Design a protein around this ligand. Structure first.
Ligand SMILES: *[C@@H]1O[C@H](CO[C@@H]2O[C@@H](C)[C@@H](O)[C@@H](O)[C@@H]2O)[C@@H](O[C@@H]2O[C@H](CO)[C@@H](O[C@@H]3O[C@H](CO)[C@@H](O)[C@H](O)[C@@H]3O)[C@H](O)[C@H]2NC(C)=O)[C@H](O)[C@H]1NC(C)=O
Ligand SMILES: C[C@H](CP(=O)(O)[C@H](Cc1ccccc1)NC(=O)[C@H](N)Cc1nnn[nH]1)C(=O)N[C@@H](C)C(N)=O
Ligand SMILES: *[C@@H]1O[C@H](CO)[C@@H](O[C@@H]2O[C@H](CO)[C@@H](O)[C@H](O)[C@H]2NC(C)=O)[C@H](O)[C@H]1NC(C)=O
Ligand SMILES: *[C@@H]1O[C@H](CO[C@@H]2O[C@@H](C)[C@@H](O)[C@@H](O)[C@@H]2O)[C@@H](O)[C@H](O)[C@H]1NC(C)=O
Ligand SMILES: [Cl-]
Ligand SMILES: [Zn+2]
Length: 607
């Protein structure tokens, strides 16, 4: 560790703790910078030499975290919990938490190499047909989205899960043991306990379950309606009206968003076509247009534009040269208050437009809290950060807004059009809920030891069937590691944040619409050009993690807890309509033939 980056001396009392805290933050910026920079170089240009530089950069950050971590515990361990300043207790609480830096050197290197290898495996895996091979993004993504051929979709689903999942498994086991070993020395029973403590709610798991119970009837009804629509296209052989849906027929590799099958489920096809992708293609929209249009929504609210550094630095398309990259969208803060970037392999579609807004939301957060102490540059909780861009995307997807931006010529205000719109949004928002809830339930069980390696896939599919009511379209066994085929698992980044954001964003939407002075139905609200709504959103963004998230929420929304009510209110019309339709069609809500799997196509796997 470079001498400048090492800690000096401070008094062993609260007043000393304040100075320790101030100096820690000054040094940390450079170490965060070189780390993030080394990660960028690798993720935008995957090579062994860049991977090695990233591993070296991570080692340095562990050195840093060790020096300052041990210093905080040297001075403050028996006394920091009774400190009078609660904002101090949060940083000294953090700095005394070493994480992987608790590992001896050889295991640090093993830990860093594992993250590097798992990430490379997920992002360079391919499905080969003969000579040629498909990558996840764009090739397999476009197949899952626009093929309606049962066999083709199955070849893509099976291919990807095998390519990514199988080689990840032995590495994921080693990672889990090293991860737990590290956080066990910080006082947590396991890494999962550490991840949960970010929400600082002693009753987090029960609060989540009580939320899910309110939402589950909305999913069951969406599920049944959709299952019926599929049965009409695929037939009685491949779809069971009383069983789970095959996991490859919902438009998405993880069946996590159902937006791509909108055309099969749209109840009133004679109204305006709310999927706007084909108009985007016809008009010749490119990535740059999508980002500029996103930016302009932000600036309409009197929030910040993207700085020159973002446009010069960002990667907005998959590289055309001979270069491999991590294609999973991501937003980047370099912790120097100047450099902020998005890395997205942007495709020209309506959902990608929402994703552009999603990522730009992360950046806008960075732009607003950049003058705060580096430790306070986070969301109020991780769910806040994930909700910002989605909030705006709610206004952007409205037919009234799509008209303003030239993507929809008709603009009708009738109950059939509302049901079309609300159903489309449910395919994106309601269909995600079960998946968003289950990923970290799986991962928490793995970290606790409840799910050992011999049950990784057993317990994944139990949860997948339990919550989503889907089944794998081919037989799986414990050699498969289907969880590993989802980005966030091998990239070791938590998921519960997405479930929290899909609820929170409707709470934000309701409050910003009210502040904008908007009076009609909540699902028709567009906050475009509302400076008042902007000022309110800005207060949350500039606060960072300096105050408890319960208080930040209260000031914005009037409530100090997560609440499903605004989401229910938003969807109320289609919730009532879907119930009615399923009764009238004699549907069964749920999948009581839980053991059912579809047969293989006759010529599997040829074509
Ligand atoms: C789409 O249409 C709805 C419904 O509009 C209402 O019913 C229709 C059948 C017609 O008869 C309309 O003339 C009638 O307004 C619109 O929602 C409605 O918007 C109005 C005005 O924004 C709301 O009236 C307000 O009510 C509040 C009290 O909550 C008062 O403070 C205000 O003074 C104001 O009068 C009305 O509540 C609202 N209706 C419902 C059921 O929520 C909607 O605006 C329209 N959408 C678009 C994009 O034009
Ligand atoms: C499209 C979005 C990408 P994201 O912006 O949340 C992406 C996911 C990710 C996480 C770690 C490494 C690399 C990427 N998150 C980010 O880029 C940011 N670092 C999130 C952030 N949080 N605080 N500051 N920044 C995402 O993954 N969405 C969920 C719903 C999904 N598609 O499963
Ligand atoms: C991808 O990364 C490699 C390093 O892994 C970069 O290659 C270096 O480029 C510089 C300047 O052009 C040379 O001086 C080095 O000798 C190169 N290293 C190697 C191992 O070849 C490369 O520039 C990166 N590509 C892009 C587009 O950024
Ligand atoms: C797990 O399954 C592996 C491959 O899958 C099998 O073959 C495919 C083509 C399907 O038809 C399906 O029935 C089978 O699952 C096997 O090679 C492997 O032996 C299995 N693993 C164990 C431990 O038995
Ligand atoms: Cl999280
Ligand atoms: Zn995100």
């Amino acid at each position: 560790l470079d001498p400048g980056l090492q800690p000096g001396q401070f008094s062993a009392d609260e007043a000393g703790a304040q100075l320790f805290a101030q100096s820690y933050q000054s040094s940390a910026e450079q170490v965060l910078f070189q780390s993030v920079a080394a990660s960028w170089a690798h993720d935008t240009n995957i090579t062994a030499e860049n991977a090695r530089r990233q591993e070296e950069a991570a080692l340095l950050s562990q050195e840093f975290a060790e020096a300052w971590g041990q210093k905080a515990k040297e001075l403050y361990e028996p006394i920091w919990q009774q400190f009078t300043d609660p904002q101090l207790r949060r940083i000294i609480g953090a700095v005394r938490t070493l994480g992987s830096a608790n590992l001896p050197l050889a295991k640090r290197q093993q830990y860093n190499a594992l993250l590097s290898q798992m990430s490379r495996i997920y992002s360079t895996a391919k499905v080969c047909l003969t000579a040629t091979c498909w990558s996840l993004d764009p090739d397999l993504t476009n197949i899952l989205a626009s093929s309606r051929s049962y066999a083709m979709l199955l070849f893509a689903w099976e291919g990807w899960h095998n390519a990514a999942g199988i080689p990840l498994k032995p590495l994921y086991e080693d990672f889990t043991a090293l991860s737990n070993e590290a956080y066990k020395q910080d006082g947590f029973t396991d890494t999962g306990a550490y991840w949960r403590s970010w929400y600082n709610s002693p009753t987090f798991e029960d609060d989540l379950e009580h939320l899910y119970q309110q939402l589950e009837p909305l999913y069951l009804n969406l599920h049944a309606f959709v299952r019926r629509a599929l049965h009409r296209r695929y037939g009685d052989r491949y779809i069971n009206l009383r069983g789970p849906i095959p996991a490859h027929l919902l438009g998405d590799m993880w069946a996590q968003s159902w937006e791509n099958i909108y055309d099969m489920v749209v109840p009133f096809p004679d109204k305006p076509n709310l999927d706007v992708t084909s108009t985007m293609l016809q008009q010749g929209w490119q990535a740059t247009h999508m980002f500029r249009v996103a930016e302009e929504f932000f600036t309409s609210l009197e929030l910040s534009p993207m700085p020159p550094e973002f446009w010069e630095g960002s990667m907005l398309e998959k590289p055309a040269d001979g270069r491999e990259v991590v294609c999973h969208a991501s937003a980047w803060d370099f912790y120097n208050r100047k450099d902020f970037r998005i890395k997205q392999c942007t495709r020209v579609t309506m959902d990608q437009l929402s994703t552009v807004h999603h990522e730009m939301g992360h950046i806008q957060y960075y732009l607003q809290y950049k003058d705060l102490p580096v430790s306070l540059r986070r969301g109020a909780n991780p769910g806040f950060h994930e909700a910002i861009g989605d909030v705006l995307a709610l206004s952007v997807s409205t037919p009234e807004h799509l008209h303003k931006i030239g993507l929809l010529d008709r603009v009708t205000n009738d109950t059939e059009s509302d049901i079309n719109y609300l159903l489309k949004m449910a395919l994106e928002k309601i269909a995600f809920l079960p998946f968003g809830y289950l990923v970290d339930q799986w991962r928490w069980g793995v970290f606790s030891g409840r799910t050992p390696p011999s049950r990784y896939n057993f317990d994944w599919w139990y949860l997948r069937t339990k919550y989503q009511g889907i089944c794998p379209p081919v037989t799986r066994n414990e050699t498969h590691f289907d969880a590993g085929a989802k980005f966030h698992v091998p990239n070791v980044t938590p998921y519960i944040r997405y479930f929290v954001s899909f609820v929170l964003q409707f709470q934000f939407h309701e409050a910003l619409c009210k502040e904008a002075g908007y009076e009609g139905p909540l699902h028709q609200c567009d906050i475009y050009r509302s400076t008042k709504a902007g000022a309110k959103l800005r207060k949350v963004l500039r606060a960072g993690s300096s105050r408890p998230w319960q208080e930040v929420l209260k000031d914005m929304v009037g409530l100090d807890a997560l609440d499903a009510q605004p989401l229910l209110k938003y969807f109320q019309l289609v919730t009532q309509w879907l119930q009615e339709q399923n009764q009238q069609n004699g549907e069964v809500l749920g999948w009581p033939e839980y053991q059912w799997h579809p047969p293989l196509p006759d010529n599997y796997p040829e074509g």
